[PDB]
Design a protein around this ligand. Structure first.
Ligand code: MG
Length: 313
C-alpha cells in the first residue's frame, strides 16, 4: 500500500458536524449541544481534567441518544441525510489515493465514518468513537431522567452548567453507559497516529486537522519530526500547527499533503509556490498568529456556517 498520511474527517473532508446533526435530528436543541460542547472544550483544554480528552462530546451525548431510542440504523440514515462535503473532496481524495493511503481519525462514530467515507471513495483506515446502540439497555426511569434533564442543561450556563454536568456524569447509571463507549478524543488520536508510525516505519508523519480534537495529534507529529497541518483551523488547532491552509477547496489539501509526502522537510520551501484560487498557506513560525487566525476563522465559517464556531469535536 501507498505510504500513509493522517487526517481528521469533519473539517478537512466533510463539512458535517455529526454530533451536532444527531443532536439536532433527535432533540432539535442547539443550545443543549452548544452547552455540552462548551463543557468538553472547558474540561479538555482549560482544566485539562485528568483522563478527559477533547472531542468526548459525542461520548457525553451517547446516553441521551440511547435514552431517546436511537438505533444503529438511525445513525446510518442521519449520516446519509446530513452528509455535505468540502468542495472537491472526492476529486482531491482520488488524486491522493493514486499514491498515498489516508488514515482517518475522527471523534465521530465509526459507523458514520464508514458510511460517509464510502460516499467519496475513501480506501484507507478508519478510526472513530465506537458505540453499539442496539446493545445499550436504558431502564424506563433512567430514560425519563435523561430526557427530562435536556431542557435543564440547555437553560444553564457557565459555572452552574459545568457543575450540573459534573454531577450528572458522575451518576453510576449514567457513568455505566458513558464507559461502554470507546471514544476517540485528542489523546486517542495521538496514540493511534503514533501506533501507525511505529508499525509502518513512518519517519515523517503528515497529519491534517482543524480543531481542539487534533491538537495532541499535532504535537505528537511535531515531536516525531513530521508536520502538523491545519485546514481552516480554529484557534486551538492554529496554536499547535506548523502549517495552516486557508482555502475553500480540498485540492489545496491534496497539493500540500502531496508535497510533504514526496519531499518531507523540503516541502516547506515550495509552499509559497502553490497557487490555487482563494488559497493561502502559512508557515506558522514565520507568520503573525492573529492575522492567520482571523482569516482562517473567516474561511471556516464560510464553509461550515454557524457549526464552524462550535467546539466539542
Ligand atoms: Mg475536525
Amino acid at each position: 500500500q501507498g505510504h500513509m498520511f493522517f487526517t481528521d474527517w469533519e473539517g478537512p473532508w466533510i463539512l458535517t458536524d455529526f454530533a451536532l446533526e444527531l443532536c439536532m435530528a433527535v432533540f432539535n436543541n442547539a443550545r443543549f449541544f452548544s452547552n455540552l460542547s462548551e463543557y468538553d472544550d472547558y474540561l479538555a483544554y482549560e482544566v485539562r481534567r485528568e483522563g478527559y480528552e477533547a472531542g468526548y462530546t459525542l461520548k457525553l451525548l451517547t446516553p441521551f441518544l440511547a435514552a431517546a431510542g436511537v438505533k444503529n440504523r438511525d445513525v446510518e440514515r442521519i449520516a446519509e441525510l446530513s452528509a455535505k462535503f468540502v468542495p472537491d473532496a472526492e476529486k482531491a481524495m482520488a488524486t491522493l489515493q493514486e499514491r498515498w493511503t489516508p488514515v482517518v481519525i475522527s471523534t465521530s462514530y465509526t459507523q458514520y465514518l464508514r458510511r460517509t467515507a464510502s460516499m467519496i471513495g475513501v480506501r484507507g483506515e478508519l478510526h472513530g468513537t465506537e458505540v453499539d446502540f442496539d446493545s445499550i439497555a436504558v431502564p424506563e426511569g433512567l430514560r425519563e431522567e435523561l430526557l427530562s434533564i435536556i431542557d435543564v442543561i440547555a437553560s444553564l450556563s457557565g459555572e452552574e452548567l459545568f457543575r450540573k454536568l459534573d454531577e450528572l456524569f458522575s451518576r453510576s447509571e449514567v457513568r455505566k453507559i458513558v464507559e461502554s463507549v470507546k471514544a476517540v478524543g485528542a489523546g486517542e488520536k495521538a496514540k493511534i497516529m503514533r501506533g501507525y508510525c511505529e508499525s509502518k516505519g513512518i519517519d515523517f508523519p503528515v497529519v491534517v486537522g482543524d480543531s481542539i480534537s487534533d491538537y495532541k495529534m499535532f504535537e505528537a507529529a511535531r515531536g516525531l519530526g513530521g508536520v502538523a497541518i491545519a485546514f481552516n483551523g480554529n484557534e486551538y488547532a492554529l496554536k499547535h500547527a506548523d502549517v495552516v491552509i486557508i482555502s475553500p477547496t480540498a485540492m489545496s489539501e491534496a497539493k500540500v499533503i502531496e508535497l510533504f509526502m514526496e519531499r518531507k522537510e523540503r516541502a516547506f520551501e515550495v509552499l509559497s509556490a502553490v497557487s490555487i484560487p482563494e488559497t493561502e498557506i502559512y508557515i506558522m513560525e514565520n507568520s503573525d498568529f492573529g492575522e492567520v487566525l482571523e482569516k482562517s476563522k473567516r474561511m471556516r465559517v464560510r464553509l461550515r456556517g454557524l457549526a464552524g464556531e462550535l467546539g466539542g469535536s
